[PDB]
Design a protein around this ligand. Structure first.
Ligand SMILES: CC(=O)CCCCC/C=C\C(=O)O
Length: 117
């Protein structure tokens, strides 16, 4: 992708923790990455969990746009601001479901640059 390998090491402890907490499998993550998203807590609560580990969302799955933007390469800033304009604020029944809807929105809007670690 555009995601550099250093980022995988950085997320490794939290990834292991969030998969363990939520019953997530690598296969589920690969599915999401392949654009296939279902409203299963084991995947959706994983995504919320990891986002939270990096202060990208708060206790009610409100996205920190600035942190999100500061994390992305300089190239995607422009298209990411557009995707956020369409897909934020988050909404849903709970934290996991809010990230499910966000994931659905962001994938529908910017498949090219869609991905989850
Ligand atoms: C849903 C998902 O995988 C997003 C993970 C965000 C983690 C990024 C952590 C560190 C960085 O980008 O430097």
């Amino acid at each position: 992708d555009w995601v550099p390998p250093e980022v995988f090491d950085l997320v490794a402890e939290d990834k292991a923790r969030c998969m363990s907490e939520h019953g997530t499998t690598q296969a589920q993550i690969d599915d999401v990455d392949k654009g296939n998203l279902v409203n299963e807590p084991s995947i959706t609560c994983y995504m919320y969990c990891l986002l939270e580990a990096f202060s990208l969302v708060d206790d009610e799955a409100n996205v920190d746009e600035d942190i999100m933007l500061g994390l992305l390469p300089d190239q995607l800033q422009e298209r990411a601001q557009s995707v956020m304009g369409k897909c934020l604020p988050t909404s849903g029944s709970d934290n996991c479901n809010k990230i499910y809807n966000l994931a659905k929105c962001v994938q529908e809007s910017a498949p090219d640059v869609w991905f989850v670690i």
